[PDB]
Design a protein around this ligand. Sequence first.
Ligand SMILES: O=[N+]([O-])c1ccc(O)c([N+](=O)[O-])c1
Ligand SMILES: O=[N+]([O-])c1ccc(O)c([N+](=O)[O-])c1
Lengths: 114, 115, 115, 114
Amino acid sequence: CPLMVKVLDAVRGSPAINVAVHVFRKAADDTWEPFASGKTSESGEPHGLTTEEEFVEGIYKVEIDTKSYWKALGISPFHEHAEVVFTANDSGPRRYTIAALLSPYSYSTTAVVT
Amino acid sequence: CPLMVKVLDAVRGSPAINVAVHVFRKAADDTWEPFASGKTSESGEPHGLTTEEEFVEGIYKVEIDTKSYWKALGISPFHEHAEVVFTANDSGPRRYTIAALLSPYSYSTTAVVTN
Amino acid sequence: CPLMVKVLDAVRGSPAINVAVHVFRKAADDTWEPFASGKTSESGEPHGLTTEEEFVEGIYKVEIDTKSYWKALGISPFHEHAEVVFTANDSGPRRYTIAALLSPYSYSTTAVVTN
Amino acid sequence: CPLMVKVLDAVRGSPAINVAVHVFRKAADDTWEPFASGKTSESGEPHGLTTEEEFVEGIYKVEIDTKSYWKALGISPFHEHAEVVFTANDSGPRRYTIAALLSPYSYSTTAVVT
Ligand SMILES: O=[N+]([O-])c1ccc(O)c([N+](=O)[O-])c1
Ligand SMILES: O=[N+]([O-])c1ccc(O)c([N+](=O)[O-])c1
Protein backbone atom coordinates (compact mmCIF):
# COMPACT_ATOMS: atom_id res chain seq x y z
CA CYS A 1 0.00 0.00 0.00
CA PRO A 2 1.62 3.19 -1.12
CA LEU A 3 -0.67 5.27 1.12
CA MET A 4 -1.91 4.47 4.61
CA VAL A 5 -3.88 6.47 7.15
CA LYS A 6 -3.89 5.97 10.90
CA VAL A 7 -6.27 7.77 13.24
CA LEU A 8 -5.81 7.98 17.00
CA ASP A 9 -8.17 9.19 19.70
CA ALA A 10 -6.44 11.44 22.31
CA VAL A 11 -9.43 11.39 24.63
CA ARG A 12 -9.95 7.63 24.90
CA GLY A 13 -6.25 6.79 24.38
CA SER A 14 -7.03 4.29 21.61
CA PRO A 15 -7.17 4.07 17.86
CA ALA A 16 -10.11 5.91 16.31
CA ILE A 17 -12.49 3.24 15.08
CA ASN A 18 -15.16 3.52 12.41
CA VAL A 19 -13.88 6.84 11.23
CA ALA A 20 -14.65 7.78 7.63
CA VAL A 21 -11.60 8.67 5.52
CA HIS A 22 -12.00 10.17 2.07
CA VAL A 23 -9.07 10.79 -0.26
CA PHE A 24 -9.17 13.13 -3.23
CA ARG A 25 -6.76 13.95 -5.99
CA LYS A 26 -6.48 17.39 -7.54
CA ALA A 27 -7.89 17.57 -11.09
CA ALA A 28 -6.73 19.97 -13.89
CA ASP A 29 -9.73 22.21 -13.15
CA ASP A 30 -8.31 22.48 -9.64
CA THR A 31 -11.31 20.50 -8.46
CA TRP A 32 -11.12 17.59 -6.04
CA GLU A 33 -11.84 14.23 -7.74
CA PRO A 34 -12.72 11.39 -5.31
CA PHE A 35 -9.76 9.00 -5.30
CA ALA A 36 -10.16 6.54 -2.45
CA SER A 37 -11.99 6.12 0.80
CA GLY A 38 -12.71 3.78 3.64
CA LYS A 39 -13.48 3.54 7.29
CA THR A 40 -10.94 2.95 9.99
CA SER A 41 -10.78 -0.51 11.51
CA GLU A 42 -10.03 -1.51 15.13
CA SER A 43 -6.43 -0.51 14.46
CA GLY A 44 -7.58 3.00 13.42
CA GLU A 45 -6.62 2.36 9.79
CA PRO A 46 -8.80 2.01 6.71
CA HIS A 47 -7.84 -1.08 4.62
CA GLY A 48 -6.21 -0.93 1.16
CA LEU A 49 -6.81 2.65 0.06
CA THR A 50 -4.97 2.54 -3.25
CA THR A 51 -2.33 0.70 -5.34
CA GLU A 52 1.18 1.48 -6.52
CA GLU A 53 -0.14 1.94 -10.10
CA GLU A 54 -2.84 4.56 -9.20
CA PHE A 55 -0.93 6.56 -6.68
CA VAL A 56 0.92 8.75 -9.13
CA GLU A 57 2.56 12.09 -8.29
CA GLY A 58 -0.15 14.66 -7.72
CA ILE A 59 -1.80 16.78 -5.07
CA TYR A 60 -3.93 14.77 -2.74
CA LYS A 61 -6.32 15.59 -0.02
CA VAL A 62 -7.10 13.22 2.84
CA GLU A 63 -10.23 14.16 4.72
CA ILE A 64 -10.93 12.50 8.03
CA ASP A 65 -14.56 12.79 9.17
CA THR A 66 -13.75 13.71 12.75
CA LYS A 67 -17.00 15.48 13.49
CA SER A 68 -19.13 12.31 13.05
CA TYR A 69 -16.64 10.45 15.09
CA TRP A 70 -16.96 12.83 18.11
CA LYS A 71 -20.78 13.01 17.73
CA ALA A 72 -20.94 9.22 18.04
CA LEU A 73 -18.92 9.51 21.22
CA GLY A 74 -21.20 12.34 22.41
CA ILE A 75 -18.51 15.00 22.57
CA SER A 76 -19.07 18.25 20.75
CA PRO A 77 -16.17 18.85 18.44
CA PHE A 78 -14.84 21.95 16.80
CA HIS A 79 -13.81 20.82 13.30
CA GLU A 80 -16.01 19.71 10.42
CA HIS A 81 -13.20 17.31 9.59
CA ALA A 82 -9.43 17.07 9.45
CA GLU A 83 -7.94 17.72 6.05
CA VAL A 84 -4.43 16.84 5.02
CA VAL A 85 -3.34 18.17 1.67
CA PHE A 86 -0.01 17.18 0.17
CA THR A 87 1.93 16.54 -3.04
CA ALA A 88 3.00 12.93 -3.56
CA ASN A 89 6.57 13.00 -4.93
CA ASP A 90 8.55 10.26 -6.72
CA SER A 91 12.01 9.96 -5.20
CA GLY A 92 13.00 6.36 -4.54
CA PRO A 93 10.80 3.76 -2.79
CA ARG A 94 8.41 5.54 -0.41
CA ARG A 95 5.27 4.50 1.45
CA TYR A 96 3.11 7.33 2.90
CA THR A 97 1.46 6.97 6.29
CA ILE A 98 -0.70 9.90 7.24
CA ALA A 99 -1.32 9.78 10.98
CA ALA A 100 -3.81 11.96 12.79
CA LEU A 101 -4.25 12.30 16.50
CA LEU A 102 -7.70 13.63 17.29
CA SER A 103 -9.12 15.65 20.12
CA PRO A 104 -12.49 17.43 20.10
CA TYR A 105 -10.95 20.87 19.62
CA SER A 106 -7.65 20.02 18.03
CA TYR A 107 -5.84 17.56 15.89
CA SER A 108 -2.30 16.94 14.87
CA THR A 109 -1.21 15.09 11.78
CA THR A 110 2.15 13.93 10.54
CA ALA A 111 3.37 12.05 7.54
CA VAL A 112 5.72 9.15 8.00
CA VAL A 113 7.48 8.51 4.67
CA THR A 114 9.50 5.28 4.68
CA CYS B 1 -11.61 40.55 16.55
CA PRO B 2 -13.85 37.51 16.58
CA LEU B 3 -11.43 35.47 14.46
CA MET B 4 -7.73 35.33 15.21
CA VAL B 5 -5.05 32.96 13.95
CA LYS B 6 -1.71 32.27 15.57
CA VAL B 7 1.02 30.39 13.81
CA LEU B 8 4.08 28.90 15.51
CA ASP B 9 7.22 27.39 14.00
CA ALA B 10 8.23 24.20 15.91
CA VAL B 11 11.64 24.03 14.19
CA ARG B 12 12.70 27.57 15.12
CA GLY B 13 10.75 27.92 18.38
CA SER B 14 9.25 31.16 17.28
CA PRO B 15 6.10 32.62 15.79
CA ALA B 16 5.77 31.78 12.09
CA ILE B 17 6.17 35.20 10.44
CA ASN B 18 5.14 36.27 6.95
CA VAL B 19 2.76 33.34 6.62
CA ALA B 20 -0.20 33.88 4.27
CA VAL B 21 -3.59 33.07 5.85
CA HIS B 22 -6.68 32.73 3.68
CA VAL B 23 -10.17 32.33 5.09
CA PHE B 24 -13.13 31.08 3.10
CA ARG B 25 -16.78 30.67 3.98
CA LYS B 26 -18.92 28.02 2.35
CA ALA B 27 -21.41 29.63 -0.05
CA ALA B 28 -25.08 28.67 -0.58
CA ASP B 29 -24.18 26.85 -3.81
CA ASP B 30 -21.73 24.96 -1.54
CA THR B 31 -18.54 26.43 -2.94
CA TRP B 32 -15.78 28.05 -0.86
CA GLU B 33 -15.98 31.82 -1.13
CA PRO B 34 -13.11 34.10 -0.20
CA PHE B 35 -13.89 35.72 3.16
CA ALA B 36 -10.63 37.12 4.47
CA SER B 37 -6.88 36.99 4.17
CA GLY B 38 -3.79 38.36 5.79
CA LYS B 39 -0.22 37.57 6.68
CA THR B 40 1.17 36.84 10.04
CA SER B 41 3.18 39.52 11.74
CA GLU B 42 6.14 39.08 14.11
CA SER B 43 3.77 37.75 16.75
CA GLY B 44 2.72 34.99 14.31
CA GLU B 45 -0.79 36.36 13.77
CA PRO B 46 -2.49 38.27 10.98
CA HIS B 47 -4.43 41.28 12.18
CA GLY B 48 -7.97 42.48 11.71
CA LEU B 49 -9.03 39.45 9.68
CA THR B 50 -12.75 40.20 10.14
CA THR B 51 -15.34 42.12 12.18
CA GLU B 52 -18.17 40.99 14.41
CA GLU B 53 -20.69 42.20 11.82
CA GLU B 54 -19.17 40.28 8.91
CA PHE B 55 -18.37 37.09 10.79
CA VAL B 56 -21.82 35.57 10.74
CA GLU B 57 -22.84 31.96 11.12
CA GLY B 58 -21.38 29.65 8.50
CA ILE B 59 -18.86 26.98 7.79
CA TYR B 60 -15.37 28.50 7.52
CA LYS B 61 -12.05 27.25 6.29
CA VAL B 62 -8.78 28.78 7.43
CA GLU B 63 -5.98 27.88 5.07
CA ILE B 64 -2.50 28.64 6.28
CA ASP B 65 0.08 28.64 3.53
CA THR B 66 2.64 26.43 5.23
CA LYS B 67 4.35 25.32 2.02
CA SER B 68 5.47 28.80 0.91
CA TYR B 69 6.61 29.39 4.47
CA TRP B 70 8.84 26.29 4.75
CA LYS B 71 10.16 26.95 1.22
CA ALA B 72 11.28 30.52 2.07
CA LEU B 73 13.17 28.97 5.01
CA GLY B 74 14.75 26.45 2.58
CA ILE B 75 12.89 23.38 3.82
CA SER B 76 10.97 21.06 1.51
CA PRO B 77 7.72 20.44 3.40
CA PHE B 78 5.14 17.63 3.17
CA HIS B 79 1.90 19.63 3.21
CA GLU B 80 0.55 22.16 0.73
CA HIS B 81 -1.07 24.05 3.58
CA ALA B 82 -2.73 23.47 6.89
CA GLU B 83 -6.53 23.53 6.73
CA VAL B 84 -8.95 24.28 9.55
CA VAL B 85 -12.64 23.91 8.69
CA PHE B 86 -15.29 24.56 11.34
CA THR B 87 -18.75 25.81 11.94
CA ALA B 88 -18.65 29.24 13.57
CA ASN B 89 -21.17 31.14 15.70
CA ASP B 90 -23.69 28.32 15.65
CA SER B 91 -24.82 29.15 19.24
CA GLY B 92 -24.36 32.89 18.79
CA PRO B 93 -21.19 34.86 18.35
CA ARG B 94 -17.99 33.44 19.87
CA ARG B 95 -14.40 34.63 19.54
CA TYR B 96 -12.19 32.04 17.86
CA THR B 97 -8.43 31.73 17.98
CA ILE B 98 -7.14 29.09 15.61
CA ALA B 99 -3.61 28.15 16.55
CA ALA B 100 -1.33 26.04 14.42
CA LEU B 101 2.04 24.61 15.35
CA LEU B 102 4.11 23.86 12.24
CA SER B 103 6.83 21.32 11.43
CA PRO B 104 8.10 20.35 8.02
CA TYR B 105 6.16 17.04 7.98
CA SER B 106 3.38 17.67 10.52
CA TYR B 107 1.29 20.35 12.09
CA SER B 108 -1.15 20.54 14.90
CA THR B 109 -3.98 22.96 15.22
CA THR B 110 -6.31 23.73 18.08
CA ALA B 111 -9.07 26.24 18.59
CA VAL B 112 -9.71 28.34 21.69
CA VAL B 113 -13.31 29.51 21.61
CA THR B 114 -14.48 32.09 24.09
CA ASN B 115 -17.82 33.76 24.73
CA CYS C 1 8.60 37.97 32.52
CA PRO C 2 11.33 35.83 31.04
CA LEU C 3 9.41 32.61 31.69
CA MET C 4 5.75 32.23 30.80
CA VAL C 5 3.59 29.13 30.52
CA LYS C 6 0.35 28.80 28.61
CA VAL C 7 -1.92 25.85 29.02
CA LEU C 8 -4.76 24.95 26.65
CA ASP C 9 -7.52 22.36 27.01
CA ALA C 10 -8.04 20.48 23.68
CA VAL C 11 -11.29 18.87 24.90
CA ARG C 12 -12.99 22.13 25.88
CA GLY C 13 -11.29 24.45 23.36
CA SER C 14 -10.32 26.86 26.04
CA PRO C 15 -7.41 27.86 28.23
CA ALA C 16 -6.76 25.30 30.98
CA ILE C 17 -7.67 27.25 34.13
CA ASN C 18 -6.67 26.53 37.73
CA VAL C 19 -3.80 24.32 36.60
CA ALA C 20 -0.87 24.07 39.04
CA VAL C 21 2.53 24.79 37.43
CA HIS C 22 5.73 23.92 39.27
CA VAL C 23 9.17 24.92 38.02
CA PHE C 24 12.39 23.36 39.23
CA ARG C 25 16.01 24.10 38.44
CA LYS C 26 18.65 21.40 38.57
CA ALA C 27 20.94 21.95 41.58
CA ALA C 28 24.74 21.51 41.71
CA ASP C 29 24.33 18.16 43.49
CA ASP C 30 22.14 17.32 40.45
CA THR C 31 18.81 17.28 42.25
CA TRP C 32 15.72 19.23 41.18
CA GLU C 33 15.28 22.29 43.36
CA PRO C 34 12.01 24.18 43.60
CA PHE C 35 12.33 27.42 41.60
CA ALA C 36 8.82 28.70 41.05
CA SER C 37 5.17 27.78 41.05
CA GLY C 38 1.81 29.23 40.22
CA LYS C 39 -1.61 28.41 38.89
CA THR C 40 -3.01 29.29 35.56
CA SER C 41 -5.54 32.07 35.39
CA GLU C 42 -8.48 32.41 32.99
CA SER C 43 -6.05 33.06 30.17
CA GLY C 44 -4.42 29.68 30.88
CA GLU C 45 -1.18 31.15 32.23
CA PRO C 46 0.30 31.61 35.67
CA HIS C 47 1.62 35.09 36.30
CA GLY C 48 4.92 36.47 37.49
CA LEU C 49 6.59 33.06 37.71
CA THR C 50 10.09 34.58 37.89
CA THR C 51 12.21 37.69 37.26
CA GLU C 52 15.08 38.37 34.90
CA GLU C 53 17.47 38.50 37.87
CA GLU C 54 16.45 35.12 39.30
CA PHE C 55 16.13 33.27 36.01
CA VAL C 56 19.79 32.57 35.43
CA GLU C 57 21.40 29.92 33.29
CA GLY C 58 20.50 26.37 34.27
CA ILE C 59 18.51 23.33 33.38
CA TYR C 60 14.83 23.86 34.22
CA LYS C 61 11.84 21.60 34.47
CA VAL C 62 8.30 22.91 34.12
CA GLU C 63 5.82 20.45 35.54
CA ILE C 64 2.20 21.11 34.73
CA ASP C 65 -0.19 19.24 36.96
CA THR C 66 -2.42 17.82 34.24
CA LYS C 67 -3.75 14.94 36.33
CA SER C 68 -5.40 17.10 39.02
CA TYR C 69 -6.80 19.23 36.22
CA TRP C 70 -8.46 16.38 34.28
CA LYS C 71 -9.71 14.89 37.57
CA ALA C 72 -11.47 18.12 38.63
CA LEU C 73 -13.21 18.01 35.22
CA GLY C 74 -14.21 14.37 35.93
CA ILE C 75 -11.90 12.75 33.38
CA SER C 76 -9.50 9.95 34.25
CA PRO C 77 -6.29 10.97 32.47
CA PHE C 78 -3.25 8.94 31.34
CA HIS C 79 -0.41 11.19 32.50
CA GLU C 80 0.59 12.29 35.99
CA HIS C 81 1.72 15.61 34.61
CA ALA C 82 3.30 17.12 31.56
CA GLU C 83 7.03 17.75 31.90
CA VAL C 84 9.15 20.26 30.00
CA VAL C 85 12.88 20.14 30.72
CA PHE C 86 15.25 22.51 28.92
CA THR C 87 18.40 24.47 29.21
CA ALA C 88 17.63 28.16 29.59
CA ASN C 89 19.68 31.30 28.86
CA ASP C 90 22.64 29.35 27.58
CA SER C 91 23.44 32.08 24.99
CA GLY C 92 22.37 34.92 27.29
CA PRO C 93 18.92 35.79 28.52
CA ARG C 94 15.95 34.82 26.33
CA ARG C 95 12.22 35.03 27.05
CA TYR C 96 10.59 31.61 27.04
CA THR C 97 6.94 30.76 26.60
CA ILE C 98 6.24 27.10 27.21
CA ALA C 99 2.88 26.18 25.75
CA ALA C 100 1.11 22.93 26.37
CA LEU C 101 -2.00 21.62 24.68
CA LEU C 102 -3.75 19.02 26.85
CA SER C 103 -5.95 16.01 26.09
CA PRO C 104 -6.87 13.21 28.45
CA TYR C 105 -4.39 10.75 26.88
CA SER C 106 -1.89 13.07 25.16
CA TYR C 107 -0.36 16.49 25.30
CA SER C 108 1.86 18.52 23.12
CA THR C 109 4.21 21.21 24.23
CA THR C 110 6.23 23.73 22.29
CA ALA C 111 8.48 26.57 23.28
CA VAL C 112 8.60 30.05 21.75
CA VAL C 113 11.94 31.61 22.59
CA THR C 114 12.53 35.27 21.86
CA ASN C 115 15.50 37.57 22.33
CA CYS D 1 5.02 -6.60 25.21
CA PRO D 2 2.92 -4.78 27.74
CA LEU D 3 4.71 -1.49 27.01
CA MET D 4 5.90 -0.13 23.67
CA VAL D 5 7.37 3.19 22.63
CA LYS D 6 7.28 4.71 19.15
CA VAL D 7 9.19 7.83 18.20
CA LEU D 8 8.52 9.87 15.06
CA ASP D 9 10.50 12.69 13.49
CA ALA D 10 8.28 15.62 12.34
CA VAL D 11 11.12 17.30 10.47
CA ARG D 12 12.27 14.37 8.33
CA GLY D 13 8.81 12.75 8.16
CA SER D 14 10.13 9.37 9.28
CA PRO D 15 10.50 7.27 12.38
CA ALA D 16 13.14 8.52 14.80
CA ILE D 17 16.00 6.06 14.59
CA ASN D 18 18.72 5.39 17.15
CA VAL D 19 16.94 7.34 19.81
CA ALA D 20 17.71 6.41 23.41
CA VAL D 21 14.65 5.53 25.53
CA HIS D 22 14.96 5.09 29.27
CA VAL D 23 12.08 3.89 31.44
CA PHE D 24 11.92 4.35 35.19
CA ARG D 25 9.54 3.19 37.86
CA LYS D 26 8.74 5.23 40.95
CA ALA D 27 10.27 3.80 44.15
CA ALA D 28 8.84 4.17 47.72
CA ASP D 29 11.38 6.95 48.39
CA ASP D 30 9.76 8.74 45.46
CA THR D 31 13.00 8.20 43.57
CA TRP D 32 13.20 6.98 40.00
CA GLU D 33 14.57 3.41 39.74
CA PRO D 34 15.81 2.42 36.25
CA PHE D 35 13.32 -0.08 34.86
CA ALA D 36 14.00 -0.61 31.17
CA SER D 37 15.71 1.03 28.27
CA GLY D 38 16.69 0.65 24.66
CA LYS D 39 17.31 2.47 21.45
CA THR D 40 14.78 2.93 18.73
CA SER D 41 15.14 0.78 15.63
CA GLU D 42 14.41 1.68 11.98
CA SER D 43 10.73 1.55 12.90
CA GLY D 44 11.30 4.15 15.65
CA GLU D 45 10.64 1.58 18.38
CA PRO D 46 13.00 0.07 20.94
CA HIS D 47 12.69 -3.76 21.08
CA GLY D 48 11.23 -5.70 24.04
CA LEU D 49 11.25 -3.16 26.86
CA THR D 50 9.62 -5.28 29.55
CA THR D 51 7.45 -8.36 30.25
CA GLU D 52 3.91 -8.92 31.50
CA GLU D 53 5.31 -10.15 34.86
CA GLU D 54 7.47 -7.02 35.58
CA PHE D 55 5.11 -4.38 34.35
CA VAL D 56 3.04 -4.12 37.49
CA GLU D 57 0.81 -1.17 38.41
CA GLY D 58 3.00 1.75 39.39
CA ILE D 59 4.12 5.18 38.29
CA TYR D 60 6.45 5.07 35.36
CA LYS D 61 8.53 7.57 33.57
CA VAL D 62 9.57 7.19 29.94
CA GLU D 63 12.40 9.50 28.98
CA ILE D 64 13.21 9.93 25.32
CA ASP D 65 16.67 11.39 24.67
CA THR D 66 15.54 13.87 22.04
CA LYS D 67 18.40 16.30 22.49
CA SER D 68 21.07 13.78 21.33
CA TYR D 69 18.84 12.84 18.50
CA TRP D 70 18.60 16.45 17.17
CA LYS D 71 22.34 17.07 17.77
CA ALA D 72 23.14 14.07 15.56
CA LEU D 73 20.95 15.61 12.88
CA GLY D 74 22.64 18.98 13.44
CA ILE D 75 19.53 20.84 14.54
CA SER D 76 19.60 22.72 17.80
CA PRO D 77 16.76 21.54 19.94
CA PHE D 78 14.99 23.06 22.88
CA HIS D 79 14.34 20.13 25.24
CA GLU D 80 16.84 18.09 27.24
CA HIS D 81 14.53 15.16 26.57
CA ALA D 82 10.88 14.24 26.39
CA GLU D 83 9.46 12.77 29.55
CA VAL D 84 6.21 10.89 29.82
CA VAL D 85 5.07 10.09 33.32
CA PHE D 86 2.04 7.91 33.93
CA THR D 87 0.40 5.38 36.25
CA ALA D 88 0.00 1.89 34.78
CA ASN D 89 -3.46 0.63 35.81
CA ASP D 90 -4.84 -2.94 35.84
CA SER D 91 -8.27 -3.00 34.22
CA GLY D 92 -8.66 -5.85 31.75
CA PRO D 93 -6.12 -6.75 29.02
CA ARG D 94 -4.20 -3.61 28.01
CA ARG D 95 -1.02 -2.98 26.04
CA TYR D 96 0.55 0.51 26.36
CA THR D 97 2.07 2.24 23.35
CA ILE D 98 3.64 5.57 24.16
CA ALA D 99 4.08 7.50 20.93
CA ALA D 100 6.07 10.70 20.62
CA LEU D 101 6.26 12.97 17.65
CA LEU D 102 9.39 15.09 17.83
CA SER D 103 10.29 18.49 16.52
CA PRO D 104 13.30 20.55 17.61
CA TYR D 105 11.21 22.94 19.72
CA SER D 106 8.19 20.83 20.49
CA TYR D 107 6.94 17.34 20.96
CA SER D 108 3.62 15.69 21.34
CA THR D 109 3.02 12.35 22.98
CA THR D 110 -0.02 10.16 23.27
CA ALA D 111 -0.76 6.82 24.81
CA VAL D 112 -2.58 4.21 22.81
CA VAL D 113 -4.04 1.65 25.24
CA THR D 114 -5.47 -1.40 23.47
O1 LIG E 1 0.41 27.82 20.95
N1 LIG E 1 -0.49 27.13 20.50
O2 LIG E 1 -1.59 27.61 20.27
C1 LIG E 1 -0.29 25.72 20.26
C2 LIG E 1 -0.79 25.11 19.11
C3 LIG E 1 -0.60 23.74 18.92
C4 LIG E 1 0.09 22.98 19.88
O3 LIG E 1 0.27 21.66 19.65
C5 LIG E 1 0.60 23.61 21.03
N2 LIG E 1 1.33 22.92 22.07
O4 LIG E 1 2.14 22.07 21.80
O5 LIG E 1 1.15 23.25 23.23
C6 LIG E 1 0.39 24.97 21.23
O1 LIG F 1 1.99 8.03 16.15
N1 LIG F 1 1.30 8.85 15.56
O2 LIG F 1 0.69 8.57 14.55
C1 LIG F 1 1.21 10.19 16.08
C2 LIG F 1 0.68 11.22 15.30
C3 LIG F 1 0.61 12.51 15.83
C4 LIG F 1 1.07 12.75 17.13
O3 LIG F 1 1.00 13.99 17.66
C5 LIG F 1 1.59 11.70 17.90
N2 LIG F 1 2.03 11.94 19.26
O4 LIG F 1 1.51 12.83 19.90
O5 LIG F 1 2.86 11.23 19.75
C6 LIG F 1 1.67 10.41 17.39
